[PDB]
Design a protein around this ligand. Structure first.
Ligand code: HEC
Ligand SMILES: [Mn+2]
Ligand SMILES: [Mn+2]
Length: 106
């Protein structure tokens, strides 16, 4: 449950959503992402290892996962309503979140 493994979970399950052709597989990938992002939110990334947990950098690092989970839930709702294609498109826009946090802190 460390940061690199959670990121492996996020990356793998985004590719799963991208190639999926059914709702069950999209839904399982998304809920798995949701869990991995909440667990990642507890880690300290290598480039913030000198920071206090209440620093603005650490606050912003953690809050990035709230935004990510928010997108995941939107996609989760489409995917529970059976709209696989809309859910996949929503998951593609998650990529702005990955990129945003990465350019600041990876
Ligand atoms: C901060 C709020 C993050 C968001 C959102 C996402 N990622 Fe991330 N990721 C983050 C950091 C700080 C790091 C560096 C970790 C380290 O220990 O060096 C990463 C790294 C990755 C990696 C590489 C992991 C590795 O084994 O080196 C991948 C493949 C990755 N991140 C993917 C990824 C995806 C697909 C995300 C959105 C669905 C995503 N990350 C969001 C911080 C944050
Ligand atoms: Mn915010
Ligand atoms: Mn966003």
């Amino acid at each position: 449950a460390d940061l690199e493994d959670n990121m492996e979970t996020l990356n793998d399950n985004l590719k799963v959503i991208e190639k999926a052709d059914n709702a069950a597989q999209v839904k399982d990938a998304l809920t798995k992402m949701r869990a991995a992002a909440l667990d990642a939110q507890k880690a300290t990334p290598p480039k913030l290892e000198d920071k206090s947990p209440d620093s603005p950098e650490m606050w912003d690092f953690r809050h990035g996962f709230d935004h990510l989970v928010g997108h995941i839930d939107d996609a989760l709702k489409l995917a529970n309503e059976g709209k696989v294609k809309e859910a996949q498109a929503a998951a593609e826009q998650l990529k702005c979140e990955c990129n945003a946090c990465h350019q600041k802190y990876r």
